[PDB]
Amino acid sequence: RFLKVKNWETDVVLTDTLHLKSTLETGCTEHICMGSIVLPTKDQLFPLAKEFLDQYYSSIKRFGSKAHMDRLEEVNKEIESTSTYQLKDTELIYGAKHAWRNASRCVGRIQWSKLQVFDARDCTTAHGMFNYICNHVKYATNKGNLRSAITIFPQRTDGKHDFRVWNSQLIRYAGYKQPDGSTLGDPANVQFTEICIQQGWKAPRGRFDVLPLLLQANGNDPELFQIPPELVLEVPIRHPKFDWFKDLGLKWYGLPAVSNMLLEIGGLEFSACPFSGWYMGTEIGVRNYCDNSRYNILEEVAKKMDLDMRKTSSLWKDQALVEINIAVLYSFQSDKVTIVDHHSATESFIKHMENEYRCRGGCPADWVWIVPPMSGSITPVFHQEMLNYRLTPSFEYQPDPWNTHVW
Amino acid sequence: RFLKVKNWETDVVLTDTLHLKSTLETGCTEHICMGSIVLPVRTKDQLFPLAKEFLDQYYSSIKRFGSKAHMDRLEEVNKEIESTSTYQLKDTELIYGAKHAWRNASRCVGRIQWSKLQVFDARDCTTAHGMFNYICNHVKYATNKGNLRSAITIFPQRTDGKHDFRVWNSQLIRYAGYKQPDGSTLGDPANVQFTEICIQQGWKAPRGRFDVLPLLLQANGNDPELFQIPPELVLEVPIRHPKFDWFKDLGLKWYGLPAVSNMLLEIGGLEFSACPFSGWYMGTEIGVRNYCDNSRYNILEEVAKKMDLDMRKTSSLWKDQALVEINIAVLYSFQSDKVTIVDHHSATESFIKHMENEYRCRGGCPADWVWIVPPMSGSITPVFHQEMLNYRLTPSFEYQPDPWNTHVWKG
Numbered sequence: 134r135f136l137k138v139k140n141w142e143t144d145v146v147l148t149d150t151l152h153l154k155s156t157l158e159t160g161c162t163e164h165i166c167m168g169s170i171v172l173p174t175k176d177q178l179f180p181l182a183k184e185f186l187d188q189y190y191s192s193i194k195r196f197g198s199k200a201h202m203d204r205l206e207e208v209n210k211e212i213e214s215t216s217t218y219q220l221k222d223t224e225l226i227y228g229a230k231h232a233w234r235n236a237s238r239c240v241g242r243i244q245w246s247k248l249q250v251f252d253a254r255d256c257t258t259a260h261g262m263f264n265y266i267c268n269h270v271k272y273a274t275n276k277g278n279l280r281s282a283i284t285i286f287p288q289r290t291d292g293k294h295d296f297r298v299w300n301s302q303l304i305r306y307a308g309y310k311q312p313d314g315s316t317l318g319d320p321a322n323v324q325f326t327e328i329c330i331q332q333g334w335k336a337p338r339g340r341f342d343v344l345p346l347l348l349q350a351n352g353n354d355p356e357l358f359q360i361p362p363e364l365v366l367e368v369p370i371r372h373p374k375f376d377w378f379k380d381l382g383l384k385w386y387g388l389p390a391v392s393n394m395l396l397e398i399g400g401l402e403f404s405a406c407p408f409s410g411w412y413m414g415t416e417i418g419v420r421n422y423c424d425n426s427r428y429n430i431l432e433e434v435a436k437k438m439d440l441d442m443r444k445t446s447s448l449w450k451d452q453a454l455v456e457i458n459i460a461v462l463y464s465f466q467s468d469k470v471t472i473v474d475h476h477s478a479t480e481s482f483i484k485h486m487e488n489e490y491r492c493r494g495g496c497p498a499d500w501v502w503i504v505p506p507m508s509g510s511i512t513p514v515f516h517q518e519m520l521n522y523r524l525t526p527s528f529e530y531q532p533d534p535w536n537t538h539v540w
Numbered sequence: 541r542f543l544k545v546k547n548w549e550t551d552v553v554l555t556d557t558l559h560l561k562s563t564l565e566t567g568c569t570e571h572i573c574m575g576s577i578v579l580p581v582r583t584k585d586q587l588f589p590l591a592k593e594f595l596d597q598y599y600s601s602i603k604r605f606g607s608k609a610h611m612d613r614l615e616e617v618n619k620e621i622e623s624t625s626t627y628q629l630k631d632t633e634l635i636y637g638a639k640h641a642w643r644n645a646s647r648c649v650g651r652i653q654w655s656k657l658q659v660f661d662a663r664d665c666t667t668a669h670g671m672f673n674y675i676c677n678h679v680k681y682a683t684n685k686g687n688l689r690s691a692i693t694i695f696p697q698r699t700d701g702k703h704d705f706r707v708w709n710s711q712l713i714r715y716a717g718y719k720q721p722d723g724s725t726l727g728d729p730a731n732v733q734f735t736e737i738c739i740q741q742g743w744k745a746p747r748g749r750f751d752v753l754p755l756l757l758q759a760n761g762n763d764p765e766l767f768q769i770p771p772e773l774v775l776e777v778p779i780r781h782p783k784f785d786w787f788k789d790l791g792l793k794w795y796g797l798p799a800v801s802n803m804l805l806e807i808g809g810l811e812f813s814a815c816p817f818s819g820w821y822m823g824t825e826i827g828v829r830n831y832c833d834n835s836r837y838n839i840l841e842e843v844a845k846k847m848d849l850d851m852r853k854t855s856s857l858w859k860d861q862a863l864v865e866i867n868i869a870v871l872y873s874f875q876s877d878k879v880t881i882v883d884h885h886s887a888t889e890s891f892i893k894h895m896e897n898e899y900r901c902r903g904g905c906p907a908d909w910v911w912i913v914p915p916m917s918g919s920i921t922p923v924f925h926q927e928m929l930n931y932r933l934t935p936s937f938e939y940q941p942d943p944w945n946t947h948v949w950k951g
C-alpha cells in the first residue's frame with residue numbers, strides 16, 4: 134500500500150503514497166509486465182466529475198466548503214438534464230496543468246505549473262481552429278524564447294462532432310515514397326503526407342517541407358491550411374568543430390507541439406488540445422536524425438568523419454551519434470532557440486521528483502521513456518527507481534483519425 | 541491467450557503464448573508497474589507439484605512425456621519426497637535445469653548462448669576448502685587463456701536452510717574497495733562493505749586500486765573461510781586506447797571473467813544457494829557502469845580533462861564524448877589481448893535474433909527492457925525499439941540477500 138523507490142547511485146529512498154489515488158489500468162498484471170509496450174454515459178460521468186471537483190477544491194484549500202458543495206450540485210444538475218457539463222475557466226486551467234503534471238512519460242514536468250492555457254472552446258469551424266493554432270504557434274515560439282502552451286478546442290459531445298487536429302504535431306516535415314525505392318524527407322509522415330496530397334496539397338517534394346495542417350471541426354471533414362512560413366521558426370544544423378557538417382543540408386524546427394492526444398478532465402474529453410514546450414536535444418539528434426526508420430543519417434555522418442565502419446566494435450555509430458547531438462545543441466544555442474540537453478533535463482527531473490514526493494506523496498514516472506535514448510546511465514534518472522501509474526486529469530494517446538472518420 | 545509485441549523500427553509483430561506457462565509474480569498490478577524496481581525452508585506439500593512441473597518440462601524436452609521412464613521418475617521422486625522430504629536431481633536434469641534458468645533469465649542479453657553452458661556438478665562438496673578447489677577449476681576452465689567459455693558450478697542444495705552453501709563474494713573476481721578517513725574511496729566503491737568483512741576475517745589488504753578480493757566461502761551453514769585465488773588464474777587486461785597514448789597512464793585494468801556468485805538457482809523446487817556462473821563481458825558493463833558510474837571508479841572527469849574537452853557546460857556533451865572513448869578503449873584492449881568481449885551493437889543484434897527464434901520455437905522469450913537496453917547509445921541498438929514482455933519462468937536465477945545479513949555466526 135505504501136511503496137518505496139530507491140535511487141541506487143545516492144541511496145536516497147522515497148515513499149510513494151500517491152499511487153493509491155490511481156485510477157486507470159496499466160496493462161501489467163501480477164503475471165506479466167508490459168512496461169515496454171508503447172500502447173498497452175450519465176452514470177459514468179458524475180463520479181468522474183466529483184472525483185475531479187473534489188481534487189480541485191482540495192487544491193484551493195476549500196474542500197467541503199459551501200462553494201465546493203454548491204459546485205458539485207450544479208454540475209450534477211447539468212449532467213442530469215444536458216448529459217454533459219462545462220468546466221469553469223479556473224477548472225480548465227487546473228485540469229490542463231494537472232494533465233501535464235500526471236504525464237508519466239514526460240521528463241520536463243518541473244515546468245508543469247507554468248503552462249499558458251488558451252481556451253478555444255468557443256471555436257466552431259476549421260478556420261477558427263487555424264486562427265487559434267497560428268496564435269498558439271506565435272505565442273509559444275516567442276522569437277526563440279519558448280513558452281509552454283496548450284490550446285483547448287470544444288469537448289467531445291456524442292462523439293460524432295469531434296474536433297481533431299489530424300497532424301501528430303503542429304509542425305512536422307513531409308515524407309514521400311520514390312520510384313528510386315527509398316524515402317525522401319521524413320519516413321514517419323509518409324501516410325499523412327499522401328492524405329494531404331489526396332486532399333489537395335501541392336507538395337514541393339523536398340526533404341524538409343513543413344506539412345499543412347488538416348483540421349477537423351465539429352466532426353466535419355477536415356480542411357487544409359498552410360501555417361504562415363514566418364511563424365515556423367527553423368534551425369539550420371552546424372557543428373562547432375566540423376565545417377563540413379552544414380553541407381549535410383540538415384534543419385529542424387524549434388517548436389515541438391504535440392497535437393494528436395486527448396486531454397481528459399473530470400470525465401470530459403478534449404480530442405483536440407495541441408500543446409507545446411521545447412525540445413530536449415536528443416529528441417532531434419538521436420531519434421529524428423538517427424532512427425533507422427527516420428532521417429537515418431548515421432551512415433552518412435560517420436563517412437564524413439572518416440571513421441572505421443568496418444567493425445561495430447570501433448563504436449563509429451556511437452562517435453557519430455555524439456557529434457550529431459553536439460551539433461543540434463550548438464545550432465539551437467547559437468540561434469537563441471530554447472533547447473535543453475539530456476543531462477540538464479534529467480537532473481531537473483530528479484529535483485522535480487523529489488519535490489513531488491515531499492509535496493504530493495509521489496510522482497508517476499515511466500522509466501522506459503524518461504531515460505534518454507543515449508548515454509542512459511550517465512544521467513541520474515537511470516539509477517532512479519520509478520513507479521508508473523495512471524492519474525487523472527491525463528493526456529491519452531488516441532488513434533489516427535483517418536481510421537475513424539467517415540467522409 | 542495470445543499476447544503481441546511490436547518492433548517499432550521494423551514493424552515485425554510477434555505472438556507470445558509462453559507467458560501462459562508463467563506462475564511466479566512480477567511486482568506489477570493492473571494499478572502499478574514496477575518495471576524499474578530493482579528488487580520488486582519448504583513443505584512436502586508445495587514441493588512435489590514443483591518437482592512434477594519441472595519433470596514434465598524435462599521429459600517433454602526429451603520427447604518422452606508420458607513414457608514409462610517419465611512415470612517411473614515421477615513416482616521415484618514422489619517417494620523420495622514423502623520419505624526424505626526433498627529429492628536429488630539426476631545429472632541429466634541438473635544440466636537441463638541450469639541451462640533453462642539461463643534461458644529464462646529475462647534480464648540477460650547474452651541468452652543466444654544458453655544451450656552451451658558447461659555444467660560442473662559440485663553436489664559432492666562438503667567443505668569450504670572443497671568449494672575453493674571447485675571454484676579454481678571453474679575459473680581456469682572458463683578463462684581458457686582468454687578464449688572464454690561459459691560455465692556454472694553447482695554446490696549442494698538447501699536442506700533446512702540452516703546448512704546453506706554460499707559464496708559470499710557477489711562475483712568470483714572483483715576488486716577491493718577501501719573507504720579512507722577523508723571520505724574518498726580507493727579501488728571499487730561497490731565493494732567497500734565486503735572488503736571490510738574480508739579484512740575483519742583476517743585478509744591482509746594490499747590497499748591498491750585493483751586488488752583482487754579473496755574468496756569468502758561458506759559450506760554447510762558453517763562460518764565462511766577465506767581463500768586467495770591463485771593470481772596466475774586471474775586473467776586481467778590493462779586498458780589502453782587505439783589513438784590516445786595517454787590513456788594507458790590512467791592505470792586502468794579490468795579482469796576478463798565476469799562470474800556472478802550471489803544468485804540462487806531454483807530447479808524443480810530445489811534451491812541451490814551457491815551456483816557461481818560466468819560467461820564473458822559486454823564492453824559497456826566495464827566501460828559504462830564500472831568505470832563511469834558516479835558511485836564506481838567515476839573516471840569521466842579525469843578522462844575528459846586529458847581529452848581537453850570543454851567541461852564548463854554539460855551541453856558540450858563532454859561526458860558523452862569521454863564515455864564513447866573509454867568504451868572504445870575497453871573493447872580495443874580486450875580484442876588486442878585476445879580476451880573474449882562483445883560490443884553492445886553486436887550483443888543486442890544477436891539478442892533480437894535469439895528472441896525472434898525463441899518466439900518461433902518456444903512461443904515467447906521473457907525479457908526485461910530496462911536491463912536489456914545497454915547503458916549508452918540506447919536507441920541506436922535494435923532492442924530499444926523492441927517491445928518485450930517480462931514474466932517469470934522456472935527454472936530460474938533469483939536474487940538473494942547478502943549472507944552477512946542473515947548468517948548465524950557459530951564462532
Ligand code: HEM
Nearest residue numbers: 233236238239240241244281283408409410411412413528
Ligand atoms: C517544457 C519543455 C518540455 C520538455 C523538455 C518535454 C520533454 C518530453 C520528452 C523528452 C518526452 C518523450 C517524448 C518522445 O520521446 O516522444 C515527452 C513526452 C511527453 N510530454 Fe513533455 N516536455 C515538455 C513539455 C510538455 C508540455 C508543455 C506538455 C503538456 C502540456 C507535455 C506533455 C507530454 C506528454 C503527454 C508526453 C508523452 C507523449 C506521448 O506519449 O507521445 N510536455 N516530454
Ligand code: HEM
Nearest residue numbers: 642645647648649650653690692817818819820821822937
Ligand atoms: C555468455 C555471455 C553473456 C553475456 C554477454 C551476458 C550479458 C549480460 C548482461 C550485460 C547482463 C546485465 C549485466 C548487469 O548490468 O549486471 C546480464 C545479466 C544476467 N545474466 Fe547474462 N550474460 C552472459 C552469460 C550468462 C550466463 C552463462 C548466465 C548463467 C548461466 C547468465 C545469467 C544472467 C542472469 C541471471 C542475469 C541477471 C543478473 C542480475 O539480476 O544481477 N548470463 N547478462
Ligand SMILES: Cc1cc(N)nc(C[C@@H]2CNC[C@@H]2NCCNCCc2cccc(F)c2)c1
Nearest residue numbers: 171172389390391408409410411412413416530
Ligand atoms: C504510437 C505512439 C504512441 C504514443 N504515446 N506516442 C507516439 C509519438 C512518438 C513517441 N515518441 C516519438 C513520437 N513522438 C514525437 C515527439 N514527441 C514530443 C514530445 C514532446 C517533447 C517536448 C515538448 C513537448 F511538448 C512534447 C506514438
Ligand SMILES: Cc1cc(N)nc(C[C@@H]2CNC[C@@H]2NCCNCCc2cccc(F)c2)c1
Nearest residue numbers: 578579650798799800817818819820821822939
Ligand atoms: C541489488 C541487486 C539486484 C540484482 N538482481 N542484481 C544486482 C547486481 C547488479 C546488476 N548490475 C550491476 C550489479 N552487478 C554486475 C554484475 N553483472 C554481470 C552479469 C553477467 C554478465 C556477463 C556474463 C555473466 F555470466 C553475467 C544487484
Ligand SMILES: C[C@H](O)[C@H](O)[C@H]1CNc2nc(N)[nH]c(=O)c2N1
Nearest residue numbers: 169170171501502924925926927
Ligand atoms: C518498444 C519501446 O517501448 C519503445 O521503443 C520506446 C522506448 N522508449 C521511448 N522513450 C521515449 N522518450 N520515446 C519513445 O518513443 C520511446 N520508445
Ligand SMILES: C[C@H](O)[C@H](O)[C@H]1CNc2nc(N)[nH]c(=O)c2N1
Nearest residue numbers: 515516517518576577578910911
Ligand atoms: C532503477 C533501475 O531499474 C536500475 O538503475 C537498473 C536500470 N537498468 C539496469 N540494467 C542493467 N543491465 N544493469 C543494471 O544494474 C541496471 N540498473
Ligand SMILES: [Zn+2]
Nearest residue numbers: 161166568573
Ligand atoms: Zn509492469
